[PDB]
Amino acid sequence: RGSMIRTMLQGKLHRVKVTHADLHYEG
Amino acid sequence: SMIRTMLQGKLHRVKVTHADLHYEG
Amino acid sequence: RGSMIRTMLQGKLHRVKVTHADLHYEG
Amino acid sequence: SMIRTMLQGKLHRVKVTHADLHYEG
Amino acid sequence: XCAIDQDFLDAAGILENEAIDIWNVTNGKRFSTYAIAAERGSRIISVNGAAAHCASVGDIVIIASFVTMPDEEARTWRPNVAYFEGDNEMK
Amino acid sequence: XCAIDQDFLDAAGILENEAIDIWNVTNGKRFSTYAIAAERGSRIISVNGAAAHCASVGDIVIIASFVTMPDEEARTWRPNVAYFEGDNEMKRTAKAIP
Amino acid sequence: XCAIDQDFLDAAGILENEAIDIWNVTNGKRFSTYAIAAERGSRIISVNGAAAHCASVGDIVIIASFVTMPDEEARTWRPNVAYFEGDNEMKRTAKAIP
Amino acid sequence: XCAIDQDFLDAAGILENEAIDIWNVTNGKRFSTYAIAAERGSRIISVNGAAAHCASVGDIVIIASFVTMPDEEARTWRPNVAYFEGDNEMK
Numbered sequence A, C: 001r002g003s004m005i006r007t008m009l010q011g012k013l014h015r016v017k018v019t020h021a022d023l024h025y026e027g
Numbered sequence B, D: 001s002m003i004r005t006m007l008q009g010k011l012h013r014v015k016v017t018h019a020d021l022h023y024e025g
Numbered sequence E, H: 001x002c003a004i005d006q007d008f009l010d011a012a013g014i015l016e017n018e019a020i021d022i023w024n025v026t027n028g029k030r031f032s033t034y035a036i037a038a039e040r041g042s043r044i045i046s047v048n049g050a051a052a053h054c055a056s057v058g059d060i061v062i063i064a065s066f067v068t069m070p071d072e073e074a075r076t077w078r079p080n081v082a083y084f085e086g087d088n089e090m091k
Numbered sequence F, G: 001x002c003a004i005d006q007d008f009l010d011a012a013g014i015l016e017n018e019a020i021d022i023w024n025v026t027n028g029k030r031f032s033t034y035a036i037a038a039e040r041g042s043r044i045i046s047v048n049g050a051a052a053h054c055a056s057v058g059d060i061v062i063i064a065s066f067v068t069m070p071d072e073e074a075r076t077w078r079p080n081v082a083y084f085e086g087d088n089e090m091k092r093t094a095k096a097i098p
Protein backbone atom coordinates (compact mmCIF):
# COMPACT_ATOMS: atom_id res chain seq x y z
CA ARG A 1 0.00 0.00 0.00
CA GLY A 2 1.53 3.32 -0.85
CA SER A 3 4.38 1.88 -2.62
CA MET A 4 6.88 4.19 -4.31
CA ILE A 5 6.72 3.74 -8.07
CA ARG A 6 9.63 3.96 -10.48
CA THR A 7 9.67 4.89 -14.19
CA MET A 8 11.83 2.28 -15.98
CA LEU A 9 12.96 1.69 -19.57
CA GLN A 10 10.59 -1.06 -20.76
CA GLY A 11 12.35 -1.60 -24.10
CA LYS A 12 13.97 0.04 -26.98
CA LEU A 13 14.72 -0.15 -30.68
CA HIS A 14 18.38 0.82 -30.88
CA ARG A 15 19.56 2.67 -34.03
CA VAL A 16 16.69 1.85 -36.33
CA LYS A 17 16.61 3.93 -39.52
CA VAL A 18 13.63 6.10 -40.45
CA THR A 19 12.09 4.72 -43.70
CA HIS A 20 9.28 7.22 -44.35
CA ALA A 21 8.10 10.65 -43.27
CA ASP A 22 4.49 11.88 -43.85
CA LEU A 23 3.59 15.33 -42.53
CA HIS A 24 0.09 15.11 -43.98
CA TYR A 25 -0.77 11.71 -42.46
CA GLU A 26 -4.51 11.37 -42.05
CA GLY A 27 -4.69 8.60 -39.27
CA SER B 1 2.59 -4.62 -11.67
CA MET B 2 3.82 -3.11 -14.98
CA ILE B 3 1.88 -0.03 -15.90
CA ARG B 4 1.83 1.28 -19.46
CA THR B 5 1.26 4.83 -20.72
CA MET B 6 -1.27 4.67 -23.62
CA LEU B 7 -2.79 7.17 -25.99
CA GLN B 8 -6.21 7.98 -24.49
CA GLY B 9 -7.49 10.08 -27.41
CA LYS B 10 -6.66 12.70 -29.92
CA LEU B 11 -8.00 15.58 -31.99
CA HIS B 12 -6.35 15.13 -35.37
CA ARG B 13 -5.61 18.24 -37.44
CA VAL B 14 -7.64 20.83 -35.68
CA LYS B 15 -6.79 24.49 -36.47
CA VAL B 16 -5.95 27.08 -33.87
CA THR B 17 -8.72 29.70 -33.93
CA HIS B 18 -7.45 32.13 -31.28
CA ALA B 19 -4.29 32.98 -29.34
CA ASP B 20 -4.44 34.90 -25.99
CA LEU B 21 -1.10 35.49 -24.30
CA HIS B 22 -2.78 37.61 -21.57
CA TYR B 23 -5.33 35.02 -20.50
CA GLU B 24 -6.43 35.30 -16.84
CA GLY B 25 -8.13 31.95 -15.98
CA ARG C 1 -8.68 -3.14 -10.34
CA GLY C 2 -7.00 -2.06 -13.52
CA SER C 3 -8.47 1.28 -13.49
CA MET C 4 -7.49 3.77 -16.18
CA ILE C 5 -5.56 6.65 -14.64
CA ARG C 6 -5.68 10.27 -15.75
CA THR C 7 -3.03 13.02 -15.40
CA MET C 8 -4.84 16.14 -14.07
CA LEU C 9 -3.81 19.70 -13.20
CA GLN C 10 -3.52 19.58 -9.39
CA GLY C 11 -2.95 23.34 -8.98
CA LYS C 12 -1.21 26.31 -10.32
CA LEU C 13 0.34 29.66 -9.51
CA HIS C 14 -0.97 31.91 -12.25
CA ARG C 15 1.28 34.79 -13.43
CA VAL C 16 3.66 34.93 -10.51
CA LYS C 17 6.77 37.03 -11.14
CA VAL C 18 10.27 35.58 -10.87
CA THR C 19 12.11 37.36 -7.97
CA HIS C 20 15.57 35.75 -8.14
CA ALA C 21 17.72 33.66 -10.45
CA ASP C 22 20.79 31.70 -9.20
CA LEU C 23 22.67 29.60 -11.75
CA HIS C 24 25.29 28.60 -9.18
CA TYR C 25 22.82 27.42 -6.52
CA GLU C 26 24.45 24.85 -4.28
CA GLY C 27 21.28 23.02 -2.85
CA SER D 1 -6.40 8.19 -4.80
CA MET D 2 -4.28 11.27 -5.69
CA ILE D 3 -0.80 10.31 -6.72
CA ARG D 4 2.04 12.84 -6.65
CA THR D 5 5.25 12.92 -8.71
CA MET D 6 8.17 13.63 -6.32
CA LEU D 7 11.89 14.13 -6.70
CA GLN D 8 13.43 10.74 -5.84
CA GLY D 9 17.07 11.89 -5.90
CA LYS D 10 19.63 13.94 -7.65
CA LEU D 11 23.31 14.28 -8.51
CA HIS D 12 24.02 17.98 -8.11
CA ARG D 13 26.69 19.56 -10.32
CA VAL D 14 28.41 16.55 -11.69
CA LYS D 15 30.64 17.11 -14.78
CA VAL D 16 30.31 15.22 -18.01
CA THR D 17 33.48 13.16 -18.47
CA HIS D 18 32.79 11.52 -21.83
CA ALA D 19 30.47 11.83 -24.83
CA ASP D 20 29.85 8.85 -27.22
CA LEU D 21 27.41 9.51 -30.05
CA HIS D 22 28.12 6.04 -31.54
CA TYR D 23 27.33 4.04 -28.42
CA GLU D 24 26.05 0.49 -29.09
CA GLY D 25 24.45 -0.71 -25.79
CA UNK E 1 -3.91 26.86 -21.56
CA CYS E 2 -5.84 25.38 -24.47
CA ALA E 3 -9.56 25.97 -24.72
CA ILE E 4 -11.39 23.40 -26.85
CA ASP E 5 -15.03 23.13 -27.98
CA GLN E 6 -16.71 20.70 -25.54
CA ASP E 7 -18.02 18.58 -28.42
CA PHE E 8 -14.44 17.92 -29.45
CA LEU E 9 -13.39 17.06 -25.86
CA ASP E 10 -16.41 14.68 -25.71
CA ALA E 11 -15.32 12.90 -28.97
CA ALA E 12 -11.72 12.44 -27.86
CA GLY E 13 -12.51 11.58 -24.21
CA ILE E 14 -10.32 14.54 -23.09
CA LEU E 15 -11.36 16.05 -19.73
CA GLU E 16 -11.40 19.61 -18.54
CA ASN E 17 -8.14 20.09 -16.54
CA GLU E 18 -6.45 17.03 -18.08
CA ALA E 19 -2.84 17.17 -19.20
CA ILE E 20 -2.61 17.37 -23.02
CA ASP E 21 0.21 17.31 -25.56
CA ILE E 22 0.00 19.66 -28.55
CA TRP E 23 1.98 18.82 -31.66
CA ASN E 24 2.01 21.65 -34.20
CA VAL E 25 1.99 20.29 -37.78
CA THR E 26 2.53 23.76 -39.22
CA ASN E 27 5.66 24.79 -37.32
CA GLY E 28 6.84 21.59 -35.63
CA LYS E 29 6.68 22.82 -32.04
CA ARG E 30 5.66 20.36 -29.37
CA PHE E 31 4.39 21.33 -25.92
CA SER E 32 2.39 20.12 -22.99
CA THR E 33 -0.39 22.02 -21.25
CA TYR E 34 -3.91 21.28 -19.93
CA ALA E 35 -7.39 21.36 -21.49
CA ILE E 36 -10.12 23.92 -20.79
CA ALA E 37 -13.65 23.64 -22.20
CA ALA E 38 -14.92 26.13 -24.75
CA GLU E 39 -18.58 26.60 -25.65
CA ARG E 40 -20.15 23.58 -27.36
CA GLY E 41 -20.47 24.13 -31.05
CA SER E 42 -18.08 27.06 -31.19
CA ARG E 43 -15.40 25.01 -32.95
CA ILE E 44 -12.83 26.92 -30.90
CA ILE E 45 -9.21 25.91 -30.32
CA SER E 46 -7.66 28.76 -28.30
CA VAL E 47 -4.04 28.78 -27.15
CA ASN E 48 -3.83 30.86 -23.91
CA GLY E 49 -1.05 32.02 -21.65
CA ALA E 50 2.50 31.01 -22.43
CA ALA E 51 1.26 28.55 -25.03
CA ALA E 52 0.50 31.49 -27.33
CA HIS E 53 4.25 31.56 -28.05
CA CYS E 54 3.98 28.10 -29.56
CA ALA E 55 1.04 28.35 -31.97
CA SER E 56 -0.53 30.99 -34.18
CA VAL E 57 -4.06 31.37 -35.50
CA GLY E 58 -4.42 29.01 -38.50
CA ASP E 59 -1.76 26.52 -37.42
CA ILE E 60 -2.81 22.86 -37.77
CA VAL E 61 -2.24 20.88 -34.55
CA ILE E 62 -2.75 17.45 -33.07
CA ILE E 63 -3.99 17.42 -29.45
CA ALA E 64 -3.47 14.24 -27.47
CA SER E 65 -4.02 12.89 -23.93
CA PHE E 66 -2.43 9.81 -22.36
CA VAL E 67 -3.62 7.48 -19.55
CA THR E 68 -1.97 4.73 -17.59
CA MET E 69 -3.22 1.18 -16.99
CA PRO E 70 -1.84 -2.30 -16.39
CA ASP E 71 -0.20 -4.15 -19.26
CA GLU E 72 -3.02 -6.70 -19.51
CA GLU E 73 -5.55 -3.95 -20.23
CA ALA E 74 -3.17 -1.94 -22.40
CA ARG E 75 -2.90 -4.82 -24.86
CA THR E 76 -6.50 -4.27 -26.04
CA TRP E 77 -6.93 -0.56 -25.26
CA ARG E 78 -8.50 1.58 -28.01
CA PRO E 79 -7.96 5.34 -28.13
CA ASN E 80 -10.65 7.89 -28.86
CA VAL E 81 -9.78 9.63 -32.13
CA ALA E 82 -11.60 12.48 -33.86
CA TYR E 83 -10.60 13.62 -37.32
CA PHE E 84 -10.98 17.17 -38.67
CA GLU E 85 -10.71 19.19 -41.84
CA GLY E 86 -11.44 22.68 -43.00
CA ASP E 87 -12.59 24.99 -40.31
CA ASN E 88 -12.58 22.39 -37.52
CA GLU E 89 -15.29 20.28 -39.09
CA MET E 90 -15.37 16.93 -37.38
CA LYS E 91 -15.20 13.86 -39.75
CA UNK F 1 15.23 24.17 -9.13
CA CYS F 2 12.40 26.62 -8.05
CA ALA F 3 12.09 28.01 -4.52
CA ILE F 4 8.57 29.28 -3.80
CA ASP F 5 7.06 31.02 -0.74
CA GLN F 6 5.39 28.30 1.36
CA ASP F 7 2.14 30.35 1.45
CA PHE F 8 2.00 30.13 -2.40
CA LEU F 9 2.69 26.38 -2.25
CA ASP F 10 -0.16 25.94 0.27
CA ALA F 11 -2.62 27.90 -1.92
CA ALA F 12 -1.80 25.85 -5.04
CA GLY F 13 -1.61 22.54 -3.11
CA ILE F 14 1.99 22.04 -4.27
CA LEU F 15 4.37 20.06 -2.05
CA GLU F 16 8.00 20.59 -1.29
CA ASN F 17 10.00 18.27 -3.68
CA GLU F 18 7.02 17.86 -6.04
CA ALA F 19 7.60 17.93 -9.79
CA ILE F 20 6.41 21.22 -11.28
CA ASP F 21 6.11 22.60 -14.84
CA ILE F 22 7.02 26.22 -15.40
CA TRP F 23 5.62 28.06 -18.43
CA ASN F 24 7.26 31.41 -19.04
CA VAL F 25 4.67 33.87 -20.38
CA THR F 26 7.31 36.52 -21.01
CA ASN F 27 9.72 34.47 -23.15
CA GLY F 28 7.70 31.34 -24.08
CA LYS F 29 10.17 28.86 -22.54
CA ARG F 30 8.65 25.74 -20.95
CA PHE F 31 10.52 23.55 -18.52
CA SER F 32 10.05 20.97 -15.78
CA THR F 33 11.79 21.02 -12.37
CA TYR F 34 10.80 20.54 -8.75
CA ALA F 35 9.57 22.78 -5.94
CA ILE F 36 11.67 24.01 -3.01
CA ALA F 37 9.89 25.79 -0.07
CA ALA F 38 11.00 29.40 0.57
CA GLU F 39 10.18 31.15 3.84
CA ARG F 40 6.53 31.91 4.48
CA GLY F 41 5.73 35.47 3.55
CA SER F 42 8.92 35.97 1.58
CA ARG F 43 6.98 36.14 -1.74
CA ILE F 44 10.05 34.47 -3.32
CA ILE F 45 10.03 32.75 -6.75
CA SER F 46 13.68 31.81 -7.27
CA VAL F 47 14.86 29.87 -10.37
CA ASN F 48 17.96 27.97 -9.39
CA GLY F 49 20.48 25.86 -11.16
CA ALA F 50 20.14 25.11 -14.85
CA ALA F 51 16.62 26.67 -14.70
CA ALA F 52 18.21 30.09 -14.49
CA HIS F 53 18.85 29.78 -18.27
CA CYS F 54 15.06 29.68 -18.77
CA ALA F 55 13.75 32.56 -16.64
CA SER F 56 14.98 35.96 -15.46
CA VAL F 57 13.96 38.30 -12.68
CA GLY F 58 10.75 40.04 -13.73
CA ASP F 59 9.52 37.29 -16.01
CA ILE F 60 5.87 36.33 -15.60
CA VAL F 61 5.40 32.55 -15.23
CA ILE F 62 2.72 29.95 -14.60
CA ILE F 63 3.84 27.18 -12.21
CA ALA F 64 1.76 23.99 -12.39
CA SER F 65 1.69 20.60 -10.71
CA PHE F 66 -0.06 17.48 -12.03
CA VAL F 67 -1.38 14.49 -10.13
CA THR F 68 -2.78 11.13 -11.24
CA MET F 69 -6.13 9.68 -10.31
CA PRO F 70 -8.84 7.35 -11.71
CA ASP F 71 -11.16 8.62 -14.37
CA GLU F 72 -14.23 8.96 -12.19
CA GLU F 73 -12.39 11.21 -9.69
CA ALA F 74 -10.81 13.11 -12.57
CA ARG F 75 -14.21 13.96 -13.99
CA THR F 76 -15.18 16.02 -10.95
CA TRP F 77 -11.72 17.23 -9.90
CA ARG F 78 -11.22 20.92 -9.03
CA PRO F 79 -7.63 22.28 -9.35
CA ASN F 80 -6.22 24.62 -6.71
CA VAL F 81 -5.56 27.91 -8.49
CA ALA F 82 -3.93 31.03 -7.09
CA TYR F 83 -3.85 34.26 -9.08
CA PHE F 84 -1.20 36.94 -8.76
CA GLU F 85 -0.66 40.58 -9.47
CA GLY F 86 1.63 43.38 -8.39
CA ASP F 87 4.31 42.41 -5.86
CA ASN F 88 3.37 38.75 -6.00
CA GLU F 89 0.14 39.59 -4.26
CA MET F 90 -2.01 36.46 -4.16
CA LYS F 91 -5.77 36.35 -4.91
CA ARG F 92 -8.28 33.44 -4.91
CA THR F 93 -9.99 34.65 -8.12
CA ALA F 94 -9.02 35.70 -11.65
CA LYS F 95 -10.95 38.31 -11.75
CA ALA F 96 -9.82 41.37 -9.66
CA ILE F 97 -6.59 41.67 -11.66
CA PRO F 98 -5.20 44.45 -14.08
CA UNK G 1 2.90 9.56 -34.92
CA CYS G 2 5.36 6.61 -35.54
CA ALA G 3 4.40 3.47 -37.47
CA ILE G 4 6.73 0.56 -36.69
CA ASP G 5 6.92 -3.01 -38.08
CA GLN G 6 4.98 -5.24 -35.66
CA ASP G 7 7.99 -7.62 -35.44
CA PHE G 8 10.10 -4.69 -34.07
CA LEU G 9 7.32 -3.81 -31.59
CA ASP G 10 7.21 -7.45 -30.39
CA ALA G 11 11.01 -7.56 -29.88
CA ALA G 12 11.05 -4.34 -27.84
CA GLY G 13 7.82 -5.20 -25.95
CA ILE G 14 6.18 -2.01 -27.26
CA LEU G 15 2.40 -1.96 -27.70
CA GLU G 16 0.29 -0.39 -30.38
CA ASN G 17 -0.90 3.04 -29.02
CA GLU G 18 1.82 3.09 -26.33
CA ALA G 19 3.66 6.34 -25.61
CA ILE G 20 7.17 6.26 -27.05
CA ASP G 21 10.18 8.61 -26.90
CA ILE G 22 12.22 9.04 -30.05
CA TRP G 23 15.83 10.25 -29.80
CA ASN G 24 17.33 11.21 -33.13
CA VAL G 25 21.03 10.27 -33.18
CA THR G 26 21.55 11.98 -36.53
CA ASN G 27 20.17 15.43 -35.68
CA GLY G 28 19.88 15.39 -31.85
CA LYS G 29 16.12 16.10 -31.77
CA ARG G 30 14.14 14.42 -28.97
CA PHE G 31 10.39 14.02 -29.04
CA SER G 32 7.54 12.01 -27.58
CA THR G 33 4.68 10.44 -29.60
CA TYR G 34 2.91 7.11 -29.73
CA ALA G 35 3.38 3.83 -31.60
CA ILE G 36 1.33 2.67 -34.58
CA ALA G 37 1.75 -0.97 -35.83
CA ALA G 38 3.00 -1.35 -39.42
CA GLU G 39 2.69 -4.65 -41.28
CA ARG G 40 4.82 -7.50 -40.00
CA GLY G 41 7.97 -7.83 -42.03
CA SER G 42 7.62 -4.41 -43.64
CA ARG G 43 10.67 -3.07 -41.71
CA ILE G 44 8.84 0.30 -41.67
CA ILE G 45 9.71 3.20 -39.32
CA SER G 46 7.41 6.00 -40.50
CA VAL G 47 7.31 9.42 -38.76
CA ASN G 48 3.88 10.86 -39.31
CA GLY G 49 2.18 14.10 -38.58
CA ALA G 50 3.98 16.87 -36.73
CA ALA G 51 6.80 14.35 -36.00
CA ALA G 52 7.90 14.63 -39.60
CA HIS G 53 9.48 18.00 -38.61
CA CYS G 54 11.80 16.06 -36.26
CA ALA G 55 13.10 13.17 -38.37
CA SER G 56 13.85 12.49 -42.04
CA VAL G 57 14.29 9.35 -44.10
CA GLY G 58 17.73 7.93 -43.33
CA ASP G 59 17.99 9.35 -39.84
CA ILE G 60 19.19 6.94 -37.17
CA VAL G 61 16.91 6.95 -34.08
CA ILE G 62 16.45 5.21 -30.75
CA ILE G 63 12.77 4.48 -29.94
CA ALA G 64 12.07 3.83 -26.25
CA SER G 65 9.08 3.01 -24.07
CA PHE G 66 8.86 3.43 -20.30
CA VAL G 67 6.70 1.61 -17.80
CA THR G 68 6.02 2.13 -14.09
CA MET G 69 6.46 -0.43 -11.36
CA PRO G 70 7.31 -0.65 -7.63
CA ASP G 71 10.88 -0.22 -6.52
CA GLU G 72 11.55 -3.85 -5.70
CA GLU G 73 10.52 -5.00 -9.21
CA ALA G 74 12.43 -2.09 -10.72
CA ARG G 75 15.63 -3.21 -9.05
CA THR G 76 15.72 -6.48 -10.99
CA TRP G 77 13.96 -5.35 -14.17
CA ARG G 78 15.47 -6.28 -17.56
CA PRO G 79 14.50 -4.03 -20.54
CA ASN G 80 13.67 -5.57 -23.92
CA VAL G 81 16.33 -4.29 -26.31
CA ALA G 82 16.57 -4.86 -30.05
CA TYR G 83 19.62 -3.77 -32.01
CA PHE G 84 19.63 -2.79 -35.67
CA GLU G 85 21.97 -2.47 -38.57
CA GLY G 86 21.81 -2.33 -42.35
CA ASP G 87 18.32 -2.49 -43.84
CA ASN G 88 16.66 -2.40 -40.44
CA GLU G 89 17.99 -5.86 -39.79
CA MET G 90 17.19 -6.78 -36.19
CA LYS G 91 19.63 -8.49 -33.77
CA ARG G 92 19.23 -9.59 -30.10
CA THR G 93 22.73 -8.34 -29.14
CA ALA G 94 24.81 -5.18 -29.46
CA LYS G 95 27.54 -6.69 -30.37
CA ALA G 96 27.63 -8.08 -33.99
CA ILE G 97 27.15 -4.59 -35.44
CA PRO G 98 29.45 -2.30 -37.66
CA UNK H 1 22.13 6.99 -22.60
CA CYS H 2 23.92 8.28 -19.51
CA ALA H 3 26.47 6.09 -17.80
CA ILE H 4 27.11 7.01 -14.16
CA ASP H 5 29.59 5.69 -11.58
CA GLN H 6 27.65 3.14 -9.47
CA ASP H 7 28.69 4.89 -6.25
CA PHE H 8 26.89 8.00 -7.45
CA LEU H 9 23.76 5.99 -8.42
CA ASP H 10 23.88 4.39 -4.93
CA ALA H 11 24.01 7.85 -3.21
CA ALA H 12 21.12 9.28 -5.21
CA GLY H 13 18.97 6.10 -5.17
CA ILE H 14 18.95 6.12 -9.01
CA LEU H 15 18.57 2.65 -10.58
CA GLU H 16 20.11 1.16 -13.66
CA ASN H 17 17.47 1.55 -16.46
CA GLU H 18 15.53 4.25 -14.59
CA ALA H 19 14.24 7.32 -16.39
CA ILE H 20 16.39 10.38 -15.56
CA ASP H 21 16.22 14.09 -16.35
CA ILE H 22 19.46 15.90 -17.18
CA TRP H 23 19.60 19.66 -16.73
CA ASN H 24 22.75 21.21 -18.19
CA VAL H 25 23.95 24.17 -16.08
CA THR H 26 26.59 25.09 -18.64
CA ASN H 27 24.42 25.38 -21.76
CA GLY H 28 20.85 25.29 -20.44
CA LYS H 29 19.68 22.23 -22.35
CA ARG H 30 17.22 19.91 -20.66
CA PHE H 31 16.58 16.32 -21.71
CA SER H 32 15.30 13.01 -20.51
CA THR H 33 17.03 9.66 -20.92
CA TYR H 34 17.77 6.59 -18.76
CA ALA H 35 20.63 5.64 -16.40
CA ILE H 36 23.31 3.02 -17.06
CA ALA H 37 25.89 1.99 -14.45
CA ALA H 38 29.55 2.80 -14.91
CA GLU H 39 32.37 1.17 -12.95
CA ARG H 40 32.35 1.99 -9.23
CA GLY H 41 34.94 4.57 -8.40
CA SER H 42 35.49 5.69 -11.96
CA ARG H 43 33.75 9.02 -11.36
CA ILE H 44 32.34 8.72 -14.89
CA ILE H 45 29.39 10.65 -16.31
CA SER H 46 29.16 9.60 -19.98
CA VAL H 47 26.52 10.94 -22.37
CA ASN H 48 25.86 8.24 -25.04
CA GLY H 49 23.77 8.02 -28.17
CA ALA H 50 21.62 10.97 -29.15
CA ALA H 51 22.26 12.59 -25.79
CA ALA H 52 25.77 13.45 -26.96
CA HIS H 53 24.15 16.31 -28.91
CA CYS H 54 23.02 17.84 -25.64
CA ALA H 55 26.16 17.85 -23.48
CA SER H 56 29.89 18.19 -23.99
CA VAL H 57 32.82 16.99 -21.91
CA GLY H 58 33.25 19.45 -19.01
CA ASP H 59 29.64 20.63 -18.89
CA ILE H 60 28.17 20.82 -15.36
CA VAL H 61 24.82 18.98 -15.10
CA ILE H 62 22.17 18.05 -12.60
CA ILE H 63 20.80 14.49 -12.94
CA ALA H 64 17.44 13.77 -11.35
CA SER H 65 14.92 10.91 -11.03
CA PHE H 66 11.27 11.14 -10.01
CA VAL H 67 8.91 8.60 -8.36
CA THR H 68 5.21 8.52 -7.74
CA MET H 69 3.38 7.83 -4.46
CA PRO H 70 0.14 8.76 -2.72
CA ASP H 71 -0.29 12.26 -1.37
CA GLU H 72 -0.16 11.12 2.26
CA GLU H 73 3.34 9.69 1.76
CA ALA H 74 4.48 12.52 -0.49
CA ARG H 75 3.94 15.04 2.30
CA THR H 76 6.93 13.66 4.25
CA TRP H 77 9.01 12.22 1.40
CA ARG H 78 12.74 13.05 1.43
CA PRO H 79 14.82 12.89 -1.75
CA ASN H 80 18.29 11.41 -2.00
CA VAL H 81 20.72 14.20 -2.87
CA ALA H 82 24.45 13.98 -3.55
CA TYR H 83 26.54 17.10 -3.98
CA PHE H 84 29.69 17.36 -6.11
CA GLU H 85 32.56 19.68 -6.90
CA GLY H 86 35.77 19.58 -8.85
CA ASP H 87 36.31 16.44 -10.77
CA ASN H 88 33.14 14.69 -9.59
CA GLU H 89 34.23 14.56 -5.97
CA MET H 90 31.25 13.71 -3.83
CA LYS H 91 30.59 16.11 -0.87
Ligand SMILES: N[C@@H](CCC(=O)O)C(=O)O
Residues within 6 Å of the ligand: B023, B024, B025, C012, C014, E001, E002, E032, E033, E034, E048, E049, E050, E051, E052, F023, F025, F062
Ligand atom coordinates in the same frame (compact mmCIF):
# COMPACT_ATOMS: atom_id res chain seq x y z
N1 LIG I 1 0.48 29.65 -19.54
C1 LIG I 1 -0.22 28.44 -19.60
C2 LIG I 1 -1.63 28.81 -19.68
C3 LIG I 1 -2.16 28.16 -18.42
C4 LIG I 1 -3.05 29.14 -17.82
O1 LIG I 1 -3.83 29.66 -18.50
O2 LIG I 1 -2.89 29.38 -16.63
C5 LIG I 1 0.44 27.76 -20.80
O3 LIG I 1 1.14 28.18 -21.04
O4 LIG I 1 0.30 26.73 -21.35
Ligand SMILES: N[C@@H](CCC(=O)O)C(=O)O
Residues within 6 Å of the ligand: C025, C027, F001, F002, F032, F033, F034, F048, F049, F050, F051, F052, H023, H062
Ligand atom coordinates in the same frame (compact mmCIF):
# COMPACT_ATOMS: atom_id res chain seq x y z
N1 LIG J 1 19.29 22.49 -11.98
C1 LIG J 1 17.94 21.96 -11.53
C2 LIG J 1 17.53 21.77 -10.04
C3 LIG J 1 18.51 21.41 -8.89
C4 LIG J 1 19.02 22.65 -7.99
O1 LIG J 1 19.77 23.41 -8.49
O2 LIG J 1 18.46 22.90 -6.89
C5 LIG J 1 17.14 22.85 -12.54
O3 LIG J 1 17.78 22.97 -13.17
O4 LIG J 1 16.05 23.01 -12.81
Ligand SMILES: N[C@@H](CCC(=O)O)C(=O)O
Residues within 6 Å of the ligand: A025, A027, E023, E062, G001, G002, G032, G033, G034, G048, G049, G050, G051, G052
Ligand atom coordinates in the same frame (compact mmCIF):
# COMPACT_ATOMS: atom_id res chain seq x y z
N1 LIG K 1 1.22 14.52 -35.07
C1 LIG K 1 1.39 13.43 -34.03
C2 LIG K 1 0.66 12.05 -34.09
C3 LIG K 1 -0.75 11.82 -34.70
C4 LIG K 1 -0.77 11.25 -36.20
O1 LIG K 1 -0.44 11.98 -37.07
O2 LIG K 1 -0.93 10.01 -36.41
C5 LIG K 1 2.95 13.57 -33.97
O3 LIG K 1 3.03 14.44 -34.24
O4 LIG K 1 3.80 13.09 -33.40
Ligand SMILES: N[C@@H](CCC(=O)O)C(=O)O
Residues within 6 Å of the ligand: A012, A014, D023, D024, D025, G023, G025, G062, H001, H002, H032, H033, H034, H048, H049, H050, H051, H052
Ligand atom coordinates in the same frame (compact mmCIF):
# COMPACT_ATOMS: atom_id res chain seq x y z
N1 LIG L 1 20.28 7.70 -27.81
C1 LIG L 1 19.95 7.51 -26.47
C2 LIG L 1 21.01 6.63 -25.94
C3 LIG L 1 20.19 5.44 -25.51
C4 LIG L 1 20.95 4.27 -25.94
O1 LIG L 1 22.08 4.24 -25.70
O2 LIG L 1 20.34 3.41 -26.57
C5 LIG L 1 19.85 8.94 -25.95
O3 LIG L 1 19.85 9.49 -26.61
O4 LIG L 1 19.60 9.44 -24.93
